Design a protein around this nucleic acid. Structure first.
Ligand code: K
Ligand code: K
Ligand code: MG
Ligand code: MG
Ligand code: MG
Ligand code: MG
Ligand code: MG
Ligand code: MG
Ligand code: MG
Ligand code: MG
Ligand code: MG
Ligand code: MG
Ligand code: MG
Ligand code: MG
Ligand code: MG
Ligand code: MG
Ligand code: MG
Ligand code: MG
Ligand code: MG
Ligand code: MG
Ligand code: MG
Ligand code: MG
Ligand code: MG
Ligand code: MG
Ligand code: MG
Ligand code: MG
Ligand code: MG
Ligand code: MG
Ligand code: MG
Ligand code: MG
Ligand code: MG
Ligand code: MG
Ligand code: MG
Ligand code: MG
Ligand code: MG
Ligand code: MG
Ligand code: MG
Ligand code: MG
Ligand code: MG
Ligand code: MG
Ligand code: MG
Ligand code: MG
Ligand code: MG
Ligand code: MG
Ligand code: MG
Ligand code: MG
Ligand code: MG
Ligand code: MG
Ligand code: MG
Ligand code: MG
Ligand code: MG
Ligand code: MG
Ligand code: MG
Ligand code: MG
Ligand code: MG
Ligand code: MG
Ligand code: MG
Lengths: 46, 271, 93
RNA sequence: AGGACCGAACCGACUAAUGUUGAAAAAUUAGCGGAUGACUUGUGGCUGGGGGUGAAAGGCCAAUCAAACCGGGAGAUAGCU
RNA sequence: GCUCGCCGGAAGACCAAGGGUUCCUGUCCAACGUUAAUCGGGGCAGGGUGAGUCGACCCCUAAGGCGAGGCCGAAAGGCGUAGUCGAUGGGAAACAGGUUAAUAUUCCUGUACUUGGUGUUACUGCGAAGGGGGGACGGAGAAGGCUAUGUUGGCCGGGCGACGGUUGUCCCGGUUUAAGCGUGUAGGCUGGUUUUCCAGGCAAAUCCGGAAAAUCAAGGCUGAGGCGUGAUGACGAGGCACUACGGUGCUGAAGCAACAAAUGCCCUGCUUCCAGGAAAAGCCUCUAAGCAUCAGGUAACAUCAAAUCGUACCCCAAACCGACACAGGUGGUCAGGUAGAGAAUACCAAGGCGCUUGAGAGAACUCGGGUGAAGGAACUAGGCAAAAUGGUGCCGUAACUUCGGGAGAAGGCACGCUGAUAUGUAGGUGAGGUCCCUCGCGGAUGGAGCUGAAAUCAGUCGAAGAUACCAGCUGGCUGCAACUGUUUAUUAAAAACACAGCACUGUGCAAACACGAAAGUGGACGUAUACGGUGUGACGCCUGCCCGGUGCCGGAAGGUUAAUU
């Protein structure tokens, strides 16, 4: 049966990637929260 | 010509089609074509703002001269063409100077006829004149509302406007709605009715024929739930409400015009 | 003209393998480990100037470094660039 | 010619049996409907929560929907266990 | 290693996505592997991915995104112009053979091709952000020419058979070769050329559009395939020679013809239909400002450049999505034989597999199947399930009907093989020869050879000839919904939704309406034969009475009545 996660690297980067995060102020707050927690990976870009 | 199809399948039994052998069978005139992709009734917020729009056949836009500005230059009709963008047919005309142009095809205009625009044009169909030069009582179409704006009234297949009175700088028109409207007498108009009057005699015959034209299905409000529509709800078939729109405004008789800016030009409402 | 500062840094090590020896004994080709940003024109200019042979053509590839485990700890070796340098038929470097 | 006929691919899901700590958090087997069209499918895009989208079942919106999910107000309040 | 079995429009092969070393070699068997494991997609170590031509990058744009200024908005920000991004589309160029344990259109051999820079020699009006052309476009159908590919013969090599026969109308195998270059064919489209004049193409134009001419009647464009060449090559049945028994090394015959033939090509054609079928660049051309014996344009030779990144492996799957080495899901390409209408189906080929627990036994009972006396729906809520029907040709076919249907109604008959008609027919294909030629990839005539249905008659075997697989049960009365569609992803597929048609009503365009503090945007580059809303639901015959209630519409005198004063 067709499951919910159908991977596409292009769609993954445009929706969740670093440049998509930096494009809005709300996405820059995601990065600010993830740097304050100390996440080893800020985004899906790696 | 109006031709009834033969019932060789249940979707063909009721199809009435309008076949015009005069329309050009080839490709349209490519310098006068543009792109127009479809909206699906969506605005720039991406929301559906007009329901029931979607799909249908791909269409190229034809640049139609509604202004008719090339005055004093004769033009000859090369051919009549199908226009997917509108009910009327169109006519490719050749001005004597070498320029081609599309116009709405009036009733009775064929390939080889001469047309001319401007103040010095004869009174015959296809010619465009300022309405102070057109006689009172005349049947015209493609009527401007502001001088030089281009024709906005009576553009659909089979439509026309009667000039009923000319009082100084205004003329009084009888619109196809039944409405009496004042328009400035310098607004241009084209003599004659719009062609293709058999357009309203087509019968689509099947559901798919409306889908070819970009009309998506209409769901009745009474078939819904109360969260969806003010008509929704009830066990079995029930109505019990005064009929309203999906947005709660009464939809059988309630008048919705409110434009005090243009009320001074309305001699009589359409009734 | 590529600077001699640059040429002395692009070539890192000879690559020693059975494919590298066959390519030398049959096709007059040396296999080199080169710097990861070294272009084909730099490798040719550095082999001709430092090894003093005459170079026909340079072919390159990037070797992706392997994931390894060291004491239940995941690691990954570095990527590196390999170069197959063909010599002109009478050089024998 | 045809939302035309029969019938594979393809799309669907009418009946039965099995399975029900499954091979599978919706399937398998044997039949079944559509199969040039209001058809099916790839890639990419757009619409965002009292909001969307809905050939309308309160359907669907990431195994979640008569108001998604995550975090916060938050130790809500609980004459109840 | 020999046998057996299974898939073969896949259970083979190859890509895209997605994964990331799972690839190859050596070594190890703790854990992992539903058992053991000497094995592994497991551990450990080493190796492995070679590009001017393939893809990405790049040039160009679609939907859409972002958006200098701008307009709008308490702030955050919204929208959007110039622009700038964005492929799922457009844009230069490489093929065959060989080779590794593991890469190959990348390496090697052979033979090619493209674009740009320079330097030249030679004739020269070059030049854009602008003009024009072109790119450049739907569905369906029809047939012709082809090729891929196959079959048969010929050819060449080998065979002479474990058991009756097998020197022959005998057996087995092979019979392959590309891009490019040359030729411009079947075929499709188009009248050519040269002057004259012009309210058009934001200005100019020698270009395009338009008007007039004179004349010429074939000029140009496009184009599968064949043929020649590429190729005295490569490949090649086999034979031989070593084997570290994995395969290497050497050698090498024939390499033709006829017929059949695609869903592939010609074909972005042609014909036809209505629902009327992207953009932009490369490319061709035109002039402008400028440049103006220069720079630059064009053709030729030469000369340099063509970077960077991807390239292993899996890819209908044990490597992706499903927690699993999970009966599920997953876009594109390739498409052999016999039978067959077929990509159904059966058996096979190339190729790949036997699905990571086995061994016995032969109780009940459960699952999946086979057969069944006599009866034949007595079963049951209900014929649920099962059984049955099933092909092609012909004969024949009712009520009713919107004249299409109903209809494959129903029901019936023939069906294998062999011989003759005819040593292979009707047909299809077409060589030699011939003739003529606007001289060819020509035409016309001619028919050798090849291929080849179906019919009738005769005979013949079996219980049975559509023998398997495959493959409609039929009819009668009636409810409902006109119909094809759509729906509760995961207990409801229906009489529900939709529908064409019908009516009421709104709406005169800065439309009504909708999304939005707004700017704006959809409606619509539409204009009342249009658009929104509502109900009803093909079609036929029809659709009666009530305006008291509630709503809507109209009125505007009087009463009542807000802020304000
Ligand atoms: K109801
Ligand atoms: K909510
Ligand atoms: Mg509507
Ligand atoms: Mg309707
Ligand atoms: Mg309902
Ligand atoms: Mg309500
Ligand atoms: Mg009731
Ligand atoms: Mg009631
Ligand atoms: Mg090379
Ligand atoms: Mg490379
Ligand atoms: Mg059909
Ligand atoms: Mg469904
Ligand atoms: Mg099934
Ligand atoms: Mg049917
Ligand atoms: Mg069918
Ligand atoms: Mg309900
Ligand atoms: Mg869900
Ligand atoms: Mg709530
Ligand atoms: Mg609180
Ligand atoms: Mg609590
Ligand atoms: Mg088999
Ligand atoms: Mg590993
Ligand atoms: Mg392996
Ligand atoms: Mg052990
Ligand atoms: Mg074990
Ligand atoms: Mg391993
Ligand atoms: Mg854009
Ligand atoms: Mg700004
Ligand atoms: Mg914007
Ligand atoms: Mg761009
Ligand atoms: Mg692309
Ligand atoms: Mg390999
Ligand atoms: Mg052939
Ligand atoms: Mg097909
Ligand atoms: Mg590979
Ligand atoms: Mg297994
Ligand atoms: Mg599986
Ligand atoms: Mg599939
Ligand atoms: Mg099969
Ligand atoms: Mg048993
Ligand atoms: Mg049993
Ligand atoms: Mg039985
Ligand atoms: Mg019995
Ligand atoms: Mg019996
Ligand atoms: Mg009986
Ligand atoms: Mg009974
Ligand atoms: Mg009983
Ligand atoms: Mg049954
Ligand atoms: Mg059965
Ligand atoms: Mg009853
Ligand atoms: Mg129905
Ligand atoms: Mg149906
Ligand atoms: Mg359900
Ligand atoms: Mg169901
Ligand atoms: Mg508007
Ligand atoms: Mg009804
Ligand atoms: Mg109804």
């Amino acid at each position: 049966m067709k499951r919910t996660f159908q991977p596409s690297v292009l769609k993954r980067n445009r929706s969740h990637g670093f440049r998509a995060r930096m494009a809005t102020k709300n996405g820059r707050q995601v990065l600010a929260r993830r740097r304050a927690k100390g996440r080893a990976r800020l985004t899906v870009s790696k | 010509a109006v031709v009834k199809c033969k019932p060789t399948s249940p979707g063909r039994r009721h199809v009435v089609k309008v076949v015009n052998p005069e329309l050009h069978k080839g490709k349209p005139f490519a310098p006068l074509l543009e792109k127009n992709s479809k909206s699906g009734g969506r605005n720039n917020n991406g929301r559906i703002t007009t329901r029931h729009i979607g799909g249908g056949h791909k269409q190229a836009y034809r640049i139609v001269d509604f202004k008719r500005n090339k005055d004093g230059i004769p033009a000859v009709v090369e051919r009549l063409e199908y226009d997917p963008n509108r009910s009327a047919n169109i006519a490719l005309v050749l001005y004597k100077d070498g320029e081609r142009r599309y116009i709405l095809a009036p009733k009775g205009l064929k390939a080889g006829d001469q047309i001319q625009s401007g103040v010095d044009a004869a009174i015959k169909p296809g010619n465009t004149l300022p309405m102070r030069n057109i006689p009172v009582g005349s049947t015209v179409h493609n009527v401007e509302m502001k001088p030089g704006k281009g024709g906005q009234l009576a553009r659909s297949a089979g439509t026309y406007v009667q000039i009923v009175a000319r009082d100084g700088a205004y003329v009084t028109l009888r619109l196809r709605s039944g409405e009496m409207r004042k328009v400035e007498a310098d607004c241009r108009a084209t003599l004659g009715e719009v062609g293709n009057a058999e357009h309203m005699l087509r019968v689509l015959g099947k559901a798919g024929a409306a889908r070819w034209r970009g009309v998506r299905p209409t769901v009745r409000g009474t078939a819904m739930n109360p969260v969806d529509h003010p008509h929704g709800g009830g066990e079995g078939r029930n109505f019990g409400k005064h009929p309203v729109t999906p947005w709660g405004v009464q939809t059988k008789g309630k008048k919705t015009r409110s434009n005090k800016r243009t009320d001074k030009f309305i001699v009589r409402r359409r009734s | 003209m590529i600077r001699e500062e640059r040429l002395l840094k692009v070539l890192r090590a000879p690559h020693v393998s059975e494919k590298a020896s066959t390519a030398m004994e049959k096709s007059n080709t040396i296999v080199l480990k080169v710097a990861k940003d070294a272009t084909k024109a730099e490798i040719k200019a550095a082999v001709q100037k430092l090894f003093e042979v005459e170079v026909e053509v340079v072919n390159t590839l990037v070797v992706k470094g392997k994931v390894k485990r060291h004491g239940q700890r995941i690691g990954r070796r570095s990527d590196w660039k390999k170069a197959y340098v063909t010599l002109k038929e009478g050089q024998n470097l």
